[PDB]
Design an enzyme around this catalytic site. Structure first.
Site, mmCIF file in Angstrom:
data_model
loop_
_atom_site.group_PDB
_atom_site.id
_atom_site.type_symbol
_atom_site.label_atom_id
_atom_site.label_comp_id
_atom_site.label_asym_id
_atom_site.label_seq_id
_atom_site.Cartn_x
_atom_site.Cartn_y
_atom_site.Cartn_z
ATOM 1 N N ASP A 132 0.893 -1.065 -0.083
ATOM 2 C CA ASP A 132 -0.029 0.126 0.013
ATOM 3 C C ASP A 132 0.643 1.248 -0.104
ATOM 4 O OD1 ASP A 132 -2.280 1.589 -0.007
ATOM 5 O OD2 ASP A 132 -2.843 1.442 1.928
ATOM 6 N N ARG A 136 -0.557 8.866 0.921
ATOM 7 C CA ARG A 136 -1.250 8.863 2.166
ATOM 8 C C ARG A 136 -0.718 8.028 3.274
ATOM 9 N NH1 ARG A 136 -3.871 6.188 -1.620
ATOM 10 N NH2 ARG A 136 -3.762 3.867 -1.213
ATOM 11 N N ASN A 137 0.158 7.322 2.972
ATOM 12 C CA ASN A 137 0.851 6.360 3.988
ATOM 13 C C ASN A 137 2.280 6.899 4.104
ATOM 14 O OD1 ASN A 137 -1.021 4.487 4.960
ATOM 15 N ND2 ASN A 137 -0.951 3.393 2.686
ATOM 16 N N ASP A 150 2.336 2.313 7.651
ATOM 17 C CA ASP A 150 1.193 1.703 7.076
ATOM 18 C C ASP A 150 0.045 1.574 8.232
ATOM 19 O OD1 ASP A 150 -0.922 0.272 5.752
ATOM 20 O OD2 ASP A 150 0.054 -1.612 5.388
HETATM 21 C C1 GV0 Z 1 -0.348 20.625 8.788
HETATM 22 N N1 GV0 Z 1 -0.763 20.431 10.174
HETATM 23 C C2 GV0 Z 1 -1.995 19.762 10.273
HETATM 24 C C3 GV0 Z 1 -2.877 19.592 11.634
HETATM 25 N N2 GV0 Z 1 -1.491 18.841 12.536
HETATM 26 C C4 GV0 Z 1 -1.466 17.398 12.762
HETATM 27 C C5 GV0 Z 1 -1.619 16.625 11.240
HETATM 28 C C6 GV0 Z 1 -1.776 15.334 11.477
HETATM 29 N N3 GV0 Z 1 -0.588 14.734 12.214
HETATM 30 C C7 GV0 Z 1 -0.317 13.352 12.340
HETATM 31 O O1 GV0 Z 1 -1.179 12.603 11.970
HETATM 32 N N4 GV0 Z 1 0.540 12.885 12.887
HETATM 33 C C8 GV0 Z 1 0.998 11.387 13.128
HETATM 34 C C9 GV0 Z 1 -0.092 10.615 13.189
HETATM 35 C C10 GV0 Z 1 0.313 9.297 13.273
HETATM 36 O O2 GV0 Z 1 -0.734 8.386 13.502
HETATM 37 C C11 GV0 Z 1 -0.418 6.932 13.065
HETATM 38 C C12 GV0 Z 1 -0.414 5.841 14.246
HETATM 39 C C13 GV0 Z 1 0.034 4.653 13.835
HETATM 40 C C14 GV0 Z 1 0.411 4.426 12.705
HETATM 41 N N5 GV0 Z 1 0.852 3.054 12.186
HETATM 42 C C15 GV0 Z 1 0.276 2.110 12.602
HETATM 43 O O3 GV0 Z 1 -0.480 1.810 13.536
HETATM 44 C C16 GV0 Z 1 0.966 0.648 12.105
HETATM 45 C C17 GV0 Z 1 1.992 0.912 11.012
HETATM 46 O O4 GV0 Z 1 2.609 2.072 10.396
HETATM 47 N N6 GV0 Z 1 2.676 -0.242 10.709
HETATM 48 C C18 GV0 Z 1 3.635 -0.161 9.563
HETATM 49 C C19 GV0 Z 1 4.762 0.761 9.645
HETATM 50 C C20 GV0 Z 1 5.823 0.528 8.734
HETATM 51 C C21 GV0 Z 1 5.810 -0.386 7.813
HETATM 52 F F1 GV0 Z 1 6.741 -0.382 6.861
HETATM 53 C C22 GV0 Z 1 4.823 -1.284 7.843
HETATM 54 C C23 GV0 Z 1 3.740 -1.186 8.700
HETATM 55 C C24 GV0 Z 1 -0.037 -0.657 11.906
HETATM 56 C C25 GV0 Z 1 1.092 -0.672 13.030
HETATM 57 C C26 GV0 Z 1 0.607 5.149 11.676
HETATM 58 F F2 GV0 Z 1 1.221 5.202 10.410
HETATM 59 C C27 GV0 Z 1 0.100 6.819 11.826
HETATM 60 C C28 GV0 Z 1 1.606 8.952 13.575
HETATM 61 C C29 GV0 Z 1 2.599 9.876 13.808
HETATM 62 N N7 GV0 Z 1 2.104 11.242 13.481
HETATM 63 C C30 GV0 Z 1 0.364 15.612 12.925
HETATM 64 C C31 GV0 Z 1 -0.475 16.840 13.335
HETATM 65 C C32 GV0 Z 1 -0.337 19.616 12.355
HETATM 66 C C33 GV0 Z 1 0.154 19.832 11.020
#
Ligand code: GV0
Length: 273
Positions: A132, A136-137, A150
């Protein structure tokens, strides 16, 4: 995965929420506190959901790379359950680039692509196929570092718990997926390289939706007829040529991610292009 003590975690701000649960900004004490994202498992759940929630954290925890989102740990013994990750101040790349339309230099955009490619090279070297890979990821931090993630947008539940037929193995992002993966479900690092070329086009258009005028079937026919995404305005020729190589029909001809990193490194160190 490391089990985090709930006393070390503070939730401060909600970032988003859906039927999956929620995502917060917060702080983590490792022992000065560090900002983190906190993904929660919605109540209630099913034991497949809970094991899948934790099992995805287990997958993420296997990786340790500058351009892969870092897992700090999990809370599994208490409720709500939590996945606690490195915090990325600028959020998802596709939204970030649409917010920043036209504001970066070509060298800055190519540096983003190099970071993504370096994360994907690490994953390829771990024999991990992402399936994926899309803007967006990709998450972006304050220093504009891009990191592969992801969250699981492809694996959300939309199946009735009693349905005869259910989706298994997740849905496919047709506009990002190589033809052999759509046709035979042959997912490899080489099909991720096709997706990477699509990400390149997302970056160089500041987040245009690929094939946006086309229905999902309209996309698949366009592709096998030989259509490829057009050259974005102000996209250097060498970058668009790299895109086309990622979109070669025969997967053995696509660059490897190691090659992509090297090509982008050489461009960055010597513009033109
Ligand atoms: C421009 N401004 C807009 C508003 N505001 C926000 C925007 C949204 N923001 C934001 O979304 N920050 C954020 C969210 C996050 O949420 C997540 C929480 C968890 C995850 N990932 C996961 O849950 C997994 C994952 O990513 N697995 C994975 C990772 C890498 C691989 F190669 C494979 C699998 C499934 C375990 C993820 F991808 C994102 C993580 C880190 N930072 C930052 C602040 C300030 C910036």
């Amino acid at each position: 995965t490391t089990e985090i003590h709930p006393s070390c975690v503070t939730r401060q701000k909600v970032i988003g929420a859906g039927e999956f649960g929620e995502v917060y900004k917060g702080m983590l004490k490792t022992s000065k506190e560090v900002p983190v994202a906190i993904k929660t498992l919605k109540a209630g759940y099913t034991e497949k959901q809970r094991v899948d929630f934790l099992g995805e954290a287990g997958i993420m925890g296997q990786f340790s790379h500058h351009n892969i989102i870092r897992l700090e740990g999990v809370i599994s013994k208490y409720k709500p359950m939590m996945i606690i990750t490195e915090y990325m101040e600028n959020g998802a790349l596709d939204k970030f680039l649409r917010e920043k339309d036209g504001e970066f230099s070509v060298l800055q955009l190519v540096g983003m692509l190099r970071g993504i490619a370096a994360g994907m090279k690490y994953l390829a070297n771990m024999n991990y196929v992402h399936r994926d890979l899309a803007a967006r990821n990709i998450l972006v931090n304050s220093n504009l570092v891009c990191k592969v993630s992801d969250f699981g947008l492809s694996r959300v539940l939309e199946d009735d718990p009693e349905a005869t037929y259910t989706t298994s193995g997740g849905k496919i992002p047709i506009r990002w997926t190589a033809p052999e993966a759509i046709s035979y479900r042959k997912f490899t690092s080489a099909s991720d390289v096709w997706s990477f070329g699509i990400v390149m086009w997302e970056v160089m258009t500041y987040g245009e939706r690929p094939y946006w005028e086309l229905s999902n079937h309209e996309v698949m026919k366009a592709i096998n007829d030989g259509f490829r995404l057009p050259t974005p305005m102000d996209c250097p020729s060498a970058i668009y040529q790299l895109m086309m190589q990622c979109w070669q029909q025969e997967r053995a001809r696509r660059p490897k991610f190691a090659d992509i990193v090297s090509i982008l490194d050489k461009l960055i160190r010597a513009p033109d292009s």
